[PDB]
Amino acid sequence: DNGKRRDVICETEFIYPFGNETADKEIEITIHLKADRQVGYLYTEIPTLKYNKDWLFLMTQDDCMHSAFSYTWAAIHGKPLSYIYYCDLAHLQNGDLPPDYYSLGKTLATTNGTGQEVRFSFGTTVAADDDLMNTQTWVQNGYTRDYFRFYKKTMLVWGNLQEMMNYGVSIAFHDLNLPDEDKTEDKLLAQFPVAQSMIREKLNNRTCKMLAEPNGDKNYIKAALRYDKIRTLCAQSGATKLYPFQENGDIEQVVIERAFYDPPEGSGLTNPDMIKAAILKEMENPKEERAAISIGAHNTDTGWVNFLEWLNDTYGRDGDDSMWFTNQEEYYEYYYYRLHSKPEIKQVNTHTWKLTLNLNGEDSAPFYYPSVTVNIFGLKMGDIESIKSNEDVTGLSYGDHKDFFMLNIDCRKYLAEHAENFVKRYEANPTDVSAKADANYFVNMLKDSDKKTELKKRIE
């Protein structure tokens, strides 16, 4: 019965198996050359930014906000949007949409430089030790007497966050659920693993490794530094300003600077206006001198939706494609790989070369973004007869970039199974255009294989 009110716990039907992700990857890519294209010497590097991007935009949305799902995630991923209301996942699943709903008509993305879409990525903080994440959602198709079921909740419900995990959204600690008088360094330290246990229980055993400092409270940074699961942190002050082409040290347990760009009072400007102005100023510098645009957000809204579209249209897929728009966790892992991994390429015979590198995350937990870019200097796509890869490589795209050759290598252990889960969702909702688009997006992440061919056929 479509018309009957239901009050449900929002749930998604699969979550990537973060707890099962392998910590250590061994990449072996065999490049067989055409007969009259024998090259003499090749050498390799991991570039400063993934996909050979010129500059970095980091986004972390604080306070575990409903709008992180209803506005930020929905706008990026081509989902129904509202101007004043706040959908939960169960509304989208059931087609119970607010009375002003609309869609942008596209996802918001860069490319990877080798012909594939990379949707914008961001992180949200989590109030995992707060029972308000267990709030129910009122679903009632066709009910128009009121729209109270679409009002802003005080925070994300778990199901919304669980679904966001399937799209690579990251997580961070923020406030912990203790009485204010108990927010001492020692008591916050004891409460971190309590919140972590709830994160792991709800997010298919993903371990949170980031702290976004709350309200300038340095007790959170001091406590977090004694909790070794936290590897990366952000704050507005007492931090390090990130210059991606200059930063040379370890950033393990380093507080990265992140700004909210609040507008002057009574100025009528918005946070997106301020960030846009900061971006324009920063782009006037050569890329090597640019700071990262490292932003925090609180509530996101229509102005933020339009700003994300502006980024897409200006520096993303529909503009100059120069930006890497990601979350701080993915960046942290990539920087770690660039510091510690050493790609090597060896000639096996006159026409065959073998590229190897290891991706090994830190001892605390499996890294969750085990993908890199490798550049090969001296090689062009036109030289290549075939490329093959070993089992640890699950996504592989490649092509020319400037005067060299680039490979985007994804080693997420369960990526093919994840794509198939999106295919199955489309098959169960074949009239949902967005479900089909998501299926195509995830299947296109896979390297060429029988499984990729099977899944493409299922989504023709």
Per-residue interface string for the shown chain with Ni ion, residues 127-156, x marking contact by CB under 5 A: ------------------------------
Closer residue to Ni ion (CB): 17 or 214: 214
Confirm whether residue 63 is marked as ligand binding.
Answer: yes
In the numeric block, the tokens 């914008």 are attached to: 120
Pair 301, 67: CB distance under 8 Å: yes
- Contacts (CB under 5 A) with Ni ion, residues 6-65: 62-63
Confirm whether residue 174 is marked as ligand binding.
Answer: yes
Closer residue to Ni ion (CB): 62 or 420: 62
- Contacts (CB under 5 A) with Ni ion, residues 315-354: none
Span from 53-61, 137-145, 208-216, 382-390 in contact with Ni ion (CB under 5 A):
208-216
- Contacts (CB under 5 A) with Ni ion, residues 59-78: 62-63
Closer residue to Ni ion (CB): 215 or 350: 215
In the complex, least distance from residue 189 CB atom to Ni ion, rounded to whole angstroms: 19
Closer residue to Ni ion (CB): 62 or 330: 62
* Helices 185-202, 158-165: crossing angle, 10 deg rounding: 70
In the complex, least distance from residue 301 CB atom to Ni ion, rounded to whole angstroms: 17
Pair 33, 385: CB distance under 8 Å: yes
Residue among 310, 349, 297 at smallest CA distance from 32: 349
In the complex, least distance from residue 295 CB atom to Ni ion, rounded to whole angstroms: 14
Q: Which residues of 315-328 are buried (b: 16+ CB within 10 A; e: fewer)?
A: bbbeeebbbbbbbb
CA atoms within 13 A of residue 382's CA, in its CB half-sphere? 5
Residue, CB closest to Ni ion: 62
Per-residue interface string for the shown chain with Ni ion, residues 273-292, x marking contact by CB under 5 A: --------------------
Does position 213 interact with Ni ion (CB under 5 A)? The reply is no
d(CA 117, CA 307): 19
Pair 61, 123: CB distance under 8 Å: yes
In the complex, least distance from residue 231 CB atom to Ni ion, rounded to whole angstroms: 21
In the complex, least distance from residue 58 CB atom to Ni ion, rounded to whole angstroms: 17
Span from 32-40, 49-57, 206-214, 392-400 in contact with Ni ion (CB under 5 A):
206-214
Closer residue to Ni ion (CB): 155 or 415: 155
Closer residue to Ni ion (CB): 62 or 96: 62
In the complex, least distance from residue 57 CB atom to Ni ion, rounded to whole angstroms: 20
Closer residue to Ni ion (CB): 33 or 133: 133
Closer residue to Ni ion (CB): 211 or 305: 211
In the complex, least distance from residue 62 CB atom to Ni ion, rounded to whole angstroms: 4
Closer residue to Ni ion (CB): 215 or 248: 215
In the complex, least distance from residue 132 CB atom to Ni ion, rounded to whole angstroms: 15
In the complex, least distance from residue 454 CB atom to Ni ion, rounded to whole angstroms: 45
> Could you give the C-alpha distances from 195 to 67, 128, 185, 369, in angstroms and in order?
22, 5, 15, 22
How many residues lie near Ni ion (CB under 5 A)?
A: 3
* Phi, psi at 367, each rounded to 5°: -50, 145
> Could you give the C-alpha distances from 115 to 7, 19, 22, 237, 447, in angstroms and in order?
43, 30, 27, 39, 13
Residues tagged in the binding site annotation? 63, 174
Residues in the annotated binding site for Zn(2+): 63, 174
List residues forming the annotated binding site for Cu(2+).
63, 174
Q: Which residues bind Ni ion (CB under 5 A)?
A: 62-63, 214
